[PDB]
Symmetry: C2
Subunit: 122 residues, 2 copies
């Protein structure tokens, strides 16, 4: 489902943002474009070092939002583009999804987002 | 209270993310590092073209989260750093805050975030 333009964004560096529902409002954490791994089945894997508040939020509501982009990829009306990703999150500490990010030796886990929609929003 | 490292980040391009409280989960939208205008009094101003869902969310709860960063600025984890900003948001459609982004002729409003806290998170 993820489009070619998305993979082009991933070729460039940038700040990824991951929003979850917290008790008193949204919560928002980050990773880097270059840290993301994409798997078959529309899955995006993030290396987790911290994200303890994020993990607790995911346990109460697995639905998350992710944005990322790059000024170096042409958008619909001008330089740069990016995406809003909606999907369901789960945390893994072993298995192939963990092996995707295991080169990051500080990772205590893998955050795996199963994408339901990806919208190019610029 | 925005620290010097934050302004270093703004010398570099990137994707800014802004999270708001939706009816049933967070909402998350973006701008570019290069579009932000910082004013005295801890104010970050964002040119608004769209952000109608975000505006309705700000009406329900003025508290927002913003993240931004840059690989080109040193952090505490080698190359790269970024910030979690918490603040109160308002949409301005007149006045000096609107004029600060009014060269963007596509702007219908300025999203003004009055920063309460800035945390360097990498
Ligand atoms: C640009 C950037 C990159 C980040 N990359 C990671 C990452 O890959 N993994 C991670 O666990 N935290 C990363 N962080 C830190 C998280 O955003 C977050 O502050 C931390 O994991 C704590 O999460 P929590 O607030 O959900 O407990 C990054 C921060 C920034 C600014
Ligand atoms: C990297 C990037 C930058 C964007 N810059 C802006 C911007 O400066 N102002 C704007 O209104 N929308 C911008 N957008 C679009 C918003 O993220 C959002 O999709 C749109 O304004 C609709 O907001 P809403 O979902 O709150 O209605 C940008 C999107 C991307 C991917």
């Amino acid at each position: 489902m993820l489009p070619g333009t998305f993979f082009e964004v991933l070729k460039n560096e940038g700040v990824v943002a991951i929003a979850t529902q917290g008790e008193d409002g949204p919560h928002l954490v980050n990773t880097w474009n270059s840290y993301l791994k994409v798997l078959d089945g529309n899955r995006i894997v993030v290396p987790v070092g911290g994200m303890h508040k994020t993990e607790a939020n995911v346990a109460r509501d697995e639905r998350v939002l992710m944005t990322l982009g790059s000024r170096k990829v042409a958008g619909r009306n001008g330089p740069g583009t990016g995406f809003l990703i909606r999907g369901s999150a789960a945390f893994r500490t072993d298995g192939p999804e963990f092996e995707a990010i295991a080169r990051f030796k500080w990772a205590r886990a893998a955050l795996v987002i199963t994408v339901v929609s990806a919208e190019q929003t610029y």
